Structure formats: structure tokens, C-alpha cells
Amino acid sequence: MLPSLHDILDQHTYKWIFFGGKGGVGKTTTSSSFSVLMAETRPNEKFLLLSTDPAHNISDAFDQKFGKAPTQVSGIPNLYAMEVDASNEMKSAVXXXXXXXXXXXXXXXXXXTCASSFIKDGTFPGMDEMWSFINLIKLIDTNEYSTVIFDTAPTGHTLRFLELPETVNKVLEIFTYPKIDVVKRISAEFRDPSLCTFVGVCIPEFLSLYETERLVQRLAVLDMDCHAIVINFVLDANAATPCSMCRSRARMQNKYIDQINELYDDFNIVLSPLRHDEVRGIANLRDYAETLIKPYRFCWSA
Amino acid sequence: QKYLLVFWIALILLIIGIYYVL
Ligand SMILES: Nc1ncnc2c1ncn2[C@@H]1O[C@H](COP(=O)(O)OP(=O)(O)O)[C@@H](O)[C@H]1O
Ligand SMILES: Nc1ncnc2c1ncn2[C@@H]1O[C@H](COP(=O)(O)OP(=O)(O)O)[C@@H](O)[C@H]1O
Ligand SMILES: [Mg+2]
Ligand SMILES: [Zn+2]
């Protein structure tokens, strides 16, 4: 009902937060801001941010450099940052199993090193999704942080990442303690609404409808709760405005905005306005978060 | 697609093999 996320902060029981959607809408700018708000409010705890998107752009939002290992933000000590890549797992592995792999391939070729060089250049499809799951599991095991925030990649990939543990436990248990229990506990938490939650981001256009419906349907399957959604790139103009451009775009948005409210009225829908400049630096973040707790005052508001 | 199928088998093996790392 209320267009805000204030109900999220009060529930300290949360452990996993997600932010997903299409590209070019503010998945990164939104996630990073929400984390800062939760940290300054709970200074006696730890918090972690993490990026699973290959187009790592968090460093450009904070104006600070980050690496493949967890670091600390200069502006605040409570918060930490991190970004996962695929050029470190292979680097650390740099084989024993790969060698045996060739033997299996050569075998069938008969019944029907040089390959090591292929490992150098990489270019192995799916490696980004495979190695990423490995890194998280190592970080998920540690129990020093309280919660974790994710800046996920497009929906086309984040879903396949969520289904991975459900299939690994299946084949593992079908072919077969510390490892299986870890993953089993993880999939258990991602499904409980009191611990996990998924949030969406979109813009007032036509493609938002089809994408949002497909997203919710695929989440209800996995039994994951979607309790809210975020809209961005909104204009605060009206027919009374003299600028023809600002007037035309507004009429195009008042249409789709009303549609979404009627369908998912049960969800917490929030509206974020458009800003003059970009969002770079802690200065602009703490101002972007105020719109998520206390709603902005638009022209048509009352 | 025949040789590519072997490549598909080569890539399909990496997926199954990488599972042991878990
Ligand atoms: N409210 C906003 N008004 C204007 N530009 C914005 C706003 N929020 C984000 N942007 C910018 O839009 C671009 C896309 O958003 P960004 O946060 O980079 O995420 P993504 O890369 O997932 O689209 C970036 O340049 C970002 O800084
Ligand atoms: N010149 C333009 N002015 C305004 N909106 C545009 C313009 N060109 C494309 N769009 C719209 O911007 C969105 C993104 O562009 P689109 O052609 O869909 O490609 P992509 O999905 O790769 O971003 C779509 O809604 C598209 O129709
Ligand atoms: Mg991004
Ligand atoms: Zn104007």
C-alpha cells in the first residue's frame, strides 16, 4: 500500500537482499544507495555489498577503486564492497581433472598440452556463471556479516543462477556431508520470506509489462517472495508545463504507471524522479535514498 | 555440427567436471 521500503529496514531478520531487472534502469545505483542507508542506521553490525554482473560499475558510482577481494569503504567503516570475476578462479586453479577430460573425449573418438593452451585464452561459455557460484559459496559459509546485497545481472542469467543449487543437490544426491548440508541450508534460506527477498526495477515503457509478469511467474515457481518494485526515470511535469517535450513524455508515462498499480496493487510500488546530473559519490547517494523512505511530492500528488 | 557436437561434448564435460570443485 504505502509507496516506500520502510517496512524492509524494520525486519532485521533479513539476510539476503536482491535487486534485479533489465539493463539501463538503475539496478546498481539503487542497490548501492539502499545499503548506505541501512549501515548508517545500524552502526553496531557488519554489512556487505556484492556485484555479480560482468559489467562491474560500482567503482564508478562510489568514485573509489575496488578489487576481486572484500575491501572497506573510505566514507564509512561499517560497509564493505566486493566484485566477483572469472579471471581469478582459473588463475588459482592453474588441470588435473581437465587432463582426464581429454582422455574421455579421446576415448569416444577411438570407439567412434595443446588443450592446456586453450585454458589460457579462456573463452569458455558459462564460466562466468559457474565460477561465480563457487566464489559466493566460499563467502556464504563465513558468518561474520549480518546481511548481503546483490547487484544482479539481467533476468536472463540471474534466474539460471538461482536454479543451479536445486539441480546440483539432485544429481549429487542421485549419484551419492559438509558440502551437501551447506548448499541444502542455502536453498532453504533463499526460499523463506523472513530471510530473503527480491526487488524489481523497471521504467514506464511498454516492455515493462511483459518482463515484469514473466519475472513474477518464474519467482513464484521457486517459491521466492516479491514484496515490492521500484520505478525510475520519472518526470515531474504536467500538461500545465510549457515545454512540449516534457509534456509529451509525461502523457506516455501516466499510462503505464496506472496499469502497473492496478495489477500489483498488493505490492509496495515506489516512484523515483529524474535528477539533473548523474549519481556519483556518497553525496548524491544519501539524497537518492530519501525518495525511497519518504515519498516525493509530484504535481498530481495530494 | 558433428565436430561441433564433440565441442558441445567437450563443453558439456567441463560443466559436469566443474561440479566436483563444489
Ligand atoms: N535518477 C536518475 N536520474 C538520471 N540518471 C540516473 C538516475 N539513476 C541512475 N542514473 C544513471 O543511469 C545510468 C544507468 O543506471 P546505473 O545505476 O548505472 O545502472 P545500470 O548500469 O544497471 O543501468 C547510469 O549512468 C546511472 O548513473
Ligand atoms: N530516439 C529514441 N527516442 C526515444 N526512445 C527511443 C529512441 N530509440 C529507441 N528508443 C526506445 O528506447 C528503448 C530501448 O531501445 P530499443 O530499440 O528497445 O533497444 P534496446 O532494448 O537494446 O535498448 C525502447 O523502448 C526503444 O523503443
Ligand atoms: Mg550495472
Ligand atoms: Zn523541458
What resolution (Å)? Answer: 3.7
Q: DSSP letter at B22?
A: -
Q: How far apart are CA A213 and CA A218, in angstroms?
A: 9
- For B:1-22, CB contacts with A below 8 A are 6, 9-11, 13-15, 17-22
Return the HEC string of chain A: CCCCCHHHHHCCCCCEEEEEECCCCCHHHHHHHHHHHHHHHCCCCCEEEEECCCCCCHHHHHCCCCCCCCEECCCCCCEEECECCCCCHHHHHCCHHHHHHHHHHHHHHHHCCHHHHHHHHCCCCCHHHHHHHHHHHHHHHCCCCCEEEEECCCHHHHHHHHHHHHHHHHHHHHHCCHHHHHHHHHHHHHHCCCCEEEEEEECCCCHHHHHHHHHHHHHHHHCCCCCEEEEEEECCCCCCCCCHHHHHHHHHHHHHHHHHHHHCCCCEEEEEECCCCCCCCHHHHHHHHHHHHCCCCCCCCC
Method: cryo-EM
Residues with CB under 6 A from ligand 1: A 23-29, 57, 232, 272, 274-275, 278-279
A-chain residues near B10 (CB < 8 A):
101, 105
> What's the grid cell of residue A250?
509525461
Do A166 and A160 touch, CB atoms closer than 8 A? no
Task: Give the domain ranges of chain A.
Answer: 1-302
Q: How far apart are CA A183 and CA A222, in angstroms?
A: 16
Q: How far apart are CA B9 and CA A258, in angstroms?
A: 50
The backbone torsions φ and ψ at residue A229, rounded to the nearest 5 degrees and listed phi first, read: -155, 155
Q: DSSP letter at B16?
A: H
A-chain residues near B4 (CB < 8 A):
none
Burial grade of A242 (CB within 10 A; 0-12, 13-18, 19 or more): exposed
Edge-to-edge order in the sheet of strand A79-81:
A71-72, A79-81, A47-51, A147-151, A16-21, A196-202, A228-234, A268-273
